[PDB]
Design a protein around this ligand. Sequence first.
Ligand SMILES: Nc1nc2c(ncn2[C@@H]2O[C@H](COP(=O)(O)OP(=O)(O)O)[C@@H](O)[C@H]2O)c(=O)[nH]1
Ligand SMILES: [Mg+2]
Lengths: 234, 72, 61, 299, 65, 158, 172
Amino acid sequence: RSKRSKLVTLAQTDKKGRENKERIFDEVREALDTYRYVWVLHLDDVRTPVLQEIRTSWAGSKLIMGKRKVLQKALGEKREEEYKENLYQLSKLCSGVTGLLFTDEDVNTVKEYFKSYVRSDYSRPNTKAPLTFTIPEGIVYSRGGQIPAEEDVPMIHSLEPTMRNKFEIPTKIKAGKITIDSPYLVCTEGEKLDVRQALILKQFGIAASEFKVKVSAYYDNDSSTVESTNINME
Amino acid sequence: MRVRKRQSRRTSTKLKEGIKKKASAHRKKEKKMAKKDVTWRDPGIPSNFPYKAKILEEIEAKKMKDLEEREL
Amino acid sequence: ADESPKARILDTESYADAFGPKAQRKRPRLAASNLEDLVKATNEDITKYEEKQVLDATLGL
Amino acid sequence: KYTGEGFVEKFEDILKGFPNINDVHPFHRDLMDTLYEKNHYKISLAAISRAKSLVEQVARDYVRLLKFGQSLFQCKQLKRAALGRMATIVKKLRDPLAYLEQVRQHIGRLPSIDPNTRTLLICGYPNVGKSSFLRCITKSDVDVQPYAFTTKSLYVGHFDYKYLRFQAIDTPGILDRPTEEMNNIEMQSIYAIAHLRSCVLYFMDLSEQCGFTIEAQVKLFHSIKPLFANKSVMVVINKTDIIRPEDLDEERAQLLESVKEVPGVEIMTSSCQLEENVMEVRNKACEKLLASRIENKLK
Amino acid sequence: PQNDYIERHIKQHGKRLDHEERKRKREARESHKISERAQKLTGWKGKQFAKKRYAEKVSMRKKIK
Amino acid sequence: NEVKYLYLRAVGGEVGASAALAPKIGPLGLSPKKVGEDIAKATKEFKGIKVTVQLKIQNRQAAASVVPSASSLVITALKEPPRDRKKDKNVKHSGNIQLDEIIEIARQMRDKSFGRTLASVTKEILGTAQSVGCRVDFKNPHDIIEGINAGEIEIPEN
Amino acid sequence: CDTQTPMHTLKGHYNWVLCVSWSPDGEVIATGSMDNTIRLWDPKSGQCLGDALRGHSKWITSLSWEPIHLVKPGSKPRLASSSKDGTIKIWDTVSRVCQYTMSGHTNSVSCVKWGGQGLLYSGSHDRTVRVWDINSQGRCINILKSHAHWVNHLSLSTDYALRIGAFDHTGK
RNA sequence: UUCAUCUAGACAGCCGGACGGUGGCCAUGGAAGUCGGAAUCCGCUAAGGAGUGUGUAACAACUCACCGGCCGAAUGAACUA
Ligand SMILES: Nc1nc2c(ncn2[C@@H]2O[C@H](COP(=O)(O)OP(=O)(O)O)[C@@H](O)[C@H]2O)c(=O)[nH]1
Ligand SMILES: [Mg+2]
């Protein structure tokens, strides 16, 4: 006895199994024969609408996500197990959230799109702060002074425990409104941000950082060699 | 801190003999009901044994031999 | 018998739907015909209440 | 006998505490009918009464039967039968008990409104400033928010004018709809206006910040015109800091004259940021109410 | 006070500062409390506790099914 | 100048529907009567039908447009007589809409859709039609979807 | 009924045949079933006319026919059907179509009757009686609200003539 | 004891995603997954309920159902004594 008890939830979606990984494996190995250029893309902390926008703009190509280990096993981990010649370099170039882009479009067009594509993104932890944020004195508003306070709806009272405990911001409730005694500086421009600061920025809705898809390299079917792209790899 | 009265564990002769009689009556009624009632009346190889494959091969060979040992 | 017993309202509407957190009643079952009839009925009820209050104040109070 | 007495005393505590819906004043009767569905109310209390009588009958019958018990086993069986029958009776009251607990909790928080004292009633469309006026003239804690039907129940405040205690009744807003599609929240205000002999203050917003036009406000006033018979009536134009009655359109001035045509109403302008003006309109309403009540008492 | 004054007070002033943490720790303690009650309650209260636990487990299994 | 965008759900054709916009409009200071008149003018095509209305505000102005929506377009193509809240309540939508008008609605809604095929957009519109409860080609919209999947129904544009 | 013997079997439906009705001109039998369908049958051949009438999401509760004296000559009478789902559907049997789908009732419709003055009367478990106009695109003329429970049945003064059409007791 | 998961990655934890038609239809003063009544679909997916709960007057926000990144070796469930 004396064990932890698992919480029981009655939801509509059940867990996936080995069959889903098998389907992704088969689809990758079919796309390797079907298409000509196979690019490796880094898409860390990407929003699903942005990913769907990329998929829509690349109509006729294929973008395959999933487990990095499954994708590397499909590409062939080593030389004696690779699906195609010299594919082990492309397989070992995968890291993190890896997307495989199978296409027949021109290399220059792909590079131009991935160099000219960028979207606004929430600031992430352990990233550079794109601005300096300080909540002003008095009633705390939903935008926190980014827009005029008369325009802005005041912050809802239900978020006050979240701001006081999780965000560690000293707040009070006056007549159902969240108030602070002095201005509160949360982040300074050009400074590494932690999880709490990122949460505060996301809660106030400031989106000043940018998302740029990273392109590691690509593999060509006919030449059977991998060429490094080094795109957005600063 | 007021300690209550503890229940005795000293054996009572009358209780012990009555328990003997009650147990004998219970056994007689159980035998009668088992004879009277109407109700319809090999775990295999444990999974944790290491040589399960060898046991299965041996029993398959024995079945294959006994199939023909009676026929011819 | 000249008259029928009253309709069993619990069959159509339950207590939970009548009142409470899960109540689905938002309008009166029998709304007034119009405001003139409503005020006439309320004035009559006020008069009857005052008459009954005087009649019980004669003895009980 | 002891178990029967316990059940009966619980039922009696339930039955004595709850008000008689028919016996109370008609204003309270209509308000409680709107809030709690008088039919369900009386049916639940009657179910309690029937259960009490049945429990008494079971207790008497089984004591009489236990007079003739011949052994411990038989007497125990009879006692268990009596307690089980009582328990079945009590189990048949699950829904009425839950309904009555909810009703008790809600009715314990209803404000005390005397339908015979001096009353300033406040009515109009939503978002015209009725709660703000109540805050200005009393010390009630009614909420003030810039969306429709912030207030869903009657709110009461008090003040003193010439050493006399006056109560002020803030109501949820009324919409210009027929009574068949009128709902319970509006029926609270309708019943308050119909029952409370008082001084009614109809608040108009000429800036249409309330989401209702001046024509709609005048139409609502003329629709609820039959309600305030033999009561003092007054029209107060709120939010004069945004727009004034003087610089309004000629057609809208004709609408205001149509409002004034109804006897014996009076039009007064006010702003809920104007202490002098809210005090002046409160004093005028009190004077009209006092004159009406004294002239009625003089006969 | 009139109408839903406790809810209005919660809306206007909030709750006690440690309300959420105290409630969370009590709900975390509930499992240990249930086990201790099962092993400590004696007599009629213990028998009633066991009967209620059985009924709750049956109801939960029916809900899952 | 800058353009302010507001979105609301209003009944098409009903004057004075901008009452719910008063908390939003108030700080900006626009005239709610003129806003309601403009909304009524912009929603003349749809009568008795809930539509999505977009208001653009610049300097001191207010312009109203109707953002297309799947359910609103299905109701409009359903061709039901206009109703009144006083008279008609709990109205069901169980009429018939033909596949050609379904494909027209799919073309209208194709611009802001992540589906790569007009067949996929048409199946989205048929799912919306199933939700509103109408019938397509005197059949179930899901039956039309299954026919498209099995390949009996060919969506024209490719 | 002359020989007290069976003549024809009609086995098109899938579930219980809840209601049956005969056309007032005597030409066709309409059956509404528990499988939410309606079927039309030629009695002389014992045969089924076309496919079943579909569209109701619940079982059929009552069937009524358009009166012969209101049916213009050269056309066949229409069929009004009620159902548990709370809707009344009007069917043109000539083209085998549905013309109107009235949906004002919030609850299950108990019965529907096609009167002699171009109106339809529907009774339902929402304690109301709805009077619809066929000539006005199926718009509800009136709502009668005086009952405190389900209206189980309704009847018209001219129901015998409506069901009998032009025929009399002499069978001419 | 019997079933399941597992170096094309076990139990916990942290972080990220958790989408689009769509604020699906009816009803409501208001009801946008979450007061209610019935449908409960399609697309794009690694995955995402016409929504498991907290929350709002309604939205917002958080969460879990599910997926992924870091971590690296066993683990979970149901029974019997
Ligand atoms: N400028 C101004 N605004 C007012 C006045 N009275 C009320 N308001 C505003 O109207 C909004 C709604 O008023 P409210 O108290 O809810 O009126 P009620 O709904 O009729 O009780 C509030 O946000 C107030 O700021 C007034 O006299 N002047
Ligand atoms: Mg108010």
